[model samples]
Target: QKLEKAKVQIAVGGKPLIYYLPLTIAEVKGFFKDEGLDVSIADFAGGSKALQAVVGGSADVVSGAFEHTLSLQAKGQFYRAFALQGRAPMIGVGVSKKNLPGYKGPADLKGRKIGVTAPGSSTNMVVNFFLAKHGLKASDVSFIGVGAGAGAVTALRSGQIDAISNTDPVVSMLETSGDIQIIVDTRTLKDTKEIFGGNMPAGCLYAPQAFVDANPNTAQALTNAIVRADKWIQKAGADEIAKAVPEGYLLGDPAVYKAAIGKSMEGLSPDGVIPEDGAATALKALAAFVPDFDAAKVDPAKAWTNEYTRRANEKYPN
Candidate 1:
């Protein structure tokens, strides 16, 4: 019932990565400003770093993976996702054609070095899950943080890494240039379902529970911007989206970014609602590789809330 805090600091990792495109869209399209909020975005190399900013009290919210909310819950820190950016992971694992032409499966990656956005980011998590599902331990392969843009491409193309687990347009760029062969792709909803057996929630805006309790209006304002972004993307074409984001996000190839948008469209949530089953999916996937993660300590229901998004949709109904 009170006026919301007008100033908000958002921490984003890999601002150029397509995985967090909604956050970029919200800012670029003036959705955030439209909410009467003075928002500042701090960009980092990966989601883990961005999450650390929020955890360390440098930011008000995180534009990061929804799974982080569940991971936080397991550690006794309660944070809840009030808005969702991606409904699917939109991650891909590609092996360098030059180095792993004989790559048959995950087992072939054993003893090899794989590049990720960061060692503990969602990109790395996907690689771990892929290997674990294939009966390989995380120790079987080494993970390198090659960042989320050209650095990732350079590392894979220049033969610095045997494979890469990243999101588009990095994945699209490599696959199109014939530098890497896709081994695991979760770009489409169907592929994501096949990998996680549920809606594996990806990027989202989350904050500590206490913050939301003190600033409900501020949280609502953020949700409005994100929900608007989600709906806008649903009806937008690849070209329209291409223009909406920063040019550097294109990574110097508009064609690749355009095509990658088409591939990633299905993964972007048409609405901001966090799937009810997504928390379990994330927990199960993490538990598969995170040794001794006490699942009983985490309540999946507390990981997210659709209340804000539901209201935002009504406020901006198109």
Candidate 2:
């Protein structure tokens, strides 16, 4: 009998960071085809946009942060994070060399203007969390909607914003210029440790709960494909992985891509299962900011299942 084929749309950001790597790997290595899944991967510029694509019915799944998923749920938007992408804290606050001396930490950010992609974006949430950790609130700082990368760089250089929450290549590029200083790397924040037991829930492979319920078999097959791709990436290193990635997806110097890719790969779980403590931690951190968020009310079991990952490991042993 011929295998059943299903088309699934997966949305992601246009960056070569680890979060989106597995999609490329699946396409290049034929993992999706192997699982009888006809997958179309779409790239957005940020996590919020990607989530919108999924919520708007343009995509079947999204590879990005769980914070946005939880935030949407708090507002009655329904989605579930199935598998984790990059495990580390992929967002941080960066300041141009011109503004570095005045900002010491989150506390010092008071009265300063910070740039973010948009109000409902993951970058926006990171900036909000960073400030709150120091007993500060969003009102204490000015948030300028400067978009990402080129827009943010221009704003910082022109003294339009005191700091910005940047991810991946932008952060790597600024670091290399010696013209930017990281006042507070969210990757090392105590809240990260408290939230996810030292693992930051940067991104995940998510889909609607209704879809997962209706198509459990398809969901498991998709998970299997991603896990295969992830294992291939872990073994092949950056150069091999880069060939599968589109050129424009990688910004900044080759060294920046290498460093960012290497760091991102460290966050992948060996079995591709969403760690319970990690999910709980991320939900808790988000709830602290959005008080209406009830982390406990949302059953993690309803959100994800480990059966697919377990089956993948059983089929392909390390």
Candidate 3:
């Protein structure tokens, strides 16, 4: 066994959910320690701020949507994804039940105020992408900034917003309570393809090229730990995985948590390898909403790697 004495400070974008379950699993189950790496996690309210932590040099890495890599590269700063957590985004777009009776679809979004986690984050990108694909423009609906989890649930219940694009188990809780009706749910494999055009690469661990060069061993260990967790999740039962997760993270009902995982578990990186096609799908999702973003200029090869994932798979082949 080899060990490297290094510390990794990671900045996170949102609450740990179905897609982010791998991170929680690795941390809670002591995978990081077994891999000879010291890992630290930090949370910010939005993807934009979390990524800024890495850019500002305060954090060693940023864990957020994989689309951030392409978006940042669009701005001339290249970030590389060394490992992935969720293969598809764990997000849903829903309308308040009170409004859903009249909601015929995207056309009904006209003159409505929609809710997203942040103004310029992945939630915003997905909401815009979904709208334009169905012949609606951003101007047709107003966007409101609702913080993650319960804040979105409260906003929809109180009539502060007409509909929301958010993650579970908040989405699950609201649906269970009959407060909102989900119009487009990308939490499952089929929905992600139908809504986003293909499999969308979202949750990932990334850092600038220099960070990897200086801490190659540390990076490799971290990726190995994450890959192992994904493999574990694939084999574990939904109820068993739910039991492994912290109760606070379950958000409301444990059954809801299990339900959320059971429904989407099949799609959560059946293998941890990051396909070039997945990277391309992520770029397409970003470019769908960000009109000025030039996806053609950035090469997908530089955006992510299967090096660590492949290595981990080889080492832990079962």
Candidate 4:
């Protein structure tokens, strides 16, 4: 195979985040190379832009949120998710230290100033779902688009937001430094189940439906790489995983990255397979935030396939 280039577009701020360990392992650990596969990655500011790249034919597949598949399917677009990663999103809500001690739970967030990645992002969806689960409504809290990473820090530090919701390792680092208190952590299995009502399929490698059948080997190869990485990550421990990613991703502090990975490792999917229940949970969450979609009538099997992941799991059961 002469450089069969399969590109992946990432939506998040990129690396140092536990949610992307599968891709990191595939690269830094050379899993793709072992498979004789050639790949490239293009990073975007957010999932929507990353997804747009795929829709615009600038990328082969998107390593963004899987919920976009459902959203697309609802609009008659045929994107199929082949291999699943990050079964439980590594996102949670946190409060600035100044608002802590008195702020106990979701109820306290009512009528408060909360920040998210954007106005209509997965982060915002999670925040809304969390509030609704606690019997609150859209009007309950005010939302600010503080974005992620350093921007999030700026908002929280400047008192522009009393609380914020985001993913690691920024969240992990902040909590470690005692600048923020993670009130609803989903980086761990226990908290993910508790907050999500159950696991929800998130990041995955997906392409348009037309490309899937003709390139069966491509799909299998990519999935096999990810499945192997998923298994390795489950038992590899935090320190090793942190060191495996690119140095720049760790913010020059491997220890903090290690802690973030450790905190979210078990929440990761052991195989590339996206559980049926997890897809259902995603639909449930989407139904709440994206009200126009017919989530009830939507079939989970149509948007995702277990075939590739099943083959990988059968080969590497560990």
- Per-residue CA lDDT of candidate 1, range 1-318, in tens? 544688899998788988888888899899988888889999987889999999899998999998888888988999999999999999999999999998887779989999988888998999888888889988999999898899999999999999999999999999899999998899998999988999999999999998889899889989999999999988988999988888888989999999999888889988898888999999988888888898878899988899999999899996
Find the candidate with the highest TM-score and give its number: 1
Rank list by lDDT = 1, 3, 4, 2
| Cα lDDT of model 2 by residue, 139-215, tens digit | 89887876545666667777888887766666666676665777545543353575335455666677777877677
- List all candidate RMSDs to the true structure: 1.1, 3.0, 2.0, 2.9
lDDT (Cα, 0-100) at 242 in candidate 4? 63
The TM-score values for the models, in the order shown, are 0.98, 0.86, 0.92, 0.86
How high is the CA lDDT of each candidate model?
A: 0.90, 0.68, 0.79, 0.74
Better of 1 and 3 by lDDT: 1
Model 1: lowest-lDDT 10 consecutive positions: 1-10
User: Which one is best on lDDT?
Assistant: 1
Query: For residues 69-154, could you state the per-residue lDDT of candidate 3 as single tens digits?
Result: 88888888888898888777877788887766677778888898888877677777788888888888788899887766667778
As for lDDT, the candidate ahead, 2 or 4, is 4
Q: How does model 3 fare in lDDT?
A: 0.79
As a TM-score, model 4 comes out at 0.86
Which scores higher on lDDT, 2 or 3? 3
Stretches of candidate 3 exceeding 4 Å from the true structure: 1-5
Instruction: List runs of model 1 lying over 4 Å from the truth.
Output: none
**Model 1 local distance difference test score:** 0.90
